[PDB]
A = this chain, B = another copy of it.
Amino acid sequence: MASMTGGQQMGRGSMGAASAAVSVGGYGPQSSSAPVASAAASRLSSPAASSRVSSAVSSLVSSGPTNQAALSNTISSVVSQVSASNPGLSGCDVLVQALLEVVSALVSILGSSSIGQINYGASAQYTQMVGQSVAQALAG
């Protein structure tokens, strides 16, 4: 991929373009928040997260994989319990864990489910469904 860097002021490259290094330091330069998502993935791999993923499967499957009401139920329940395990973590960390855990549950549905014709235009509508579940769930 090779990320892009600014013409001047920091943003030094890496790998190659240097036969030998004659500088001493610790942590290299940064641009995007990587370790945040990395940490979320690590605790996402925890046994607690995996169990919640399974529960997300049963909820969506029984109520309706593509139902507004069913999706709202899954987001609300998962966010609550994920907070219960992680009181030490900041409020933002709670939101991260709930959201990506919902992503994993949906992946499980796709693998078990069959893919037909993609209704590309309505993709925005389903986006509204997810945004709706967040607002209603945390609104009250």
Contact = CB atoms under 8 A, between A and B. Distances in A.
A117 B112 contact: yes
Most B-side CB within 10 Å, residue of A40, A94, A99, A117: A99
Given A54-B120, A113-B114, A96 B99 contact: yes
Contact of A88 (B14, B100, B130): B14
A122 B35 CA distance: 27
Interface size class of A (residues with CB under 8 A): 35 or more
Most B-side CB within 10 Å, residue of A41, A95, A131, A138: A131
Interface string A33-44: 111111011101
A119 interface: yes
Nearest to A140: B34
Interface of A: 1, 3, 14, 17, 31-38, 40-42, 44-45, 49-50, 53-54, 56-58, 61, 65-66, 71, 76, 79-80, 83, 87-88, 90-96, 98-120, 122-124, 126-132, 134-135, 137-140
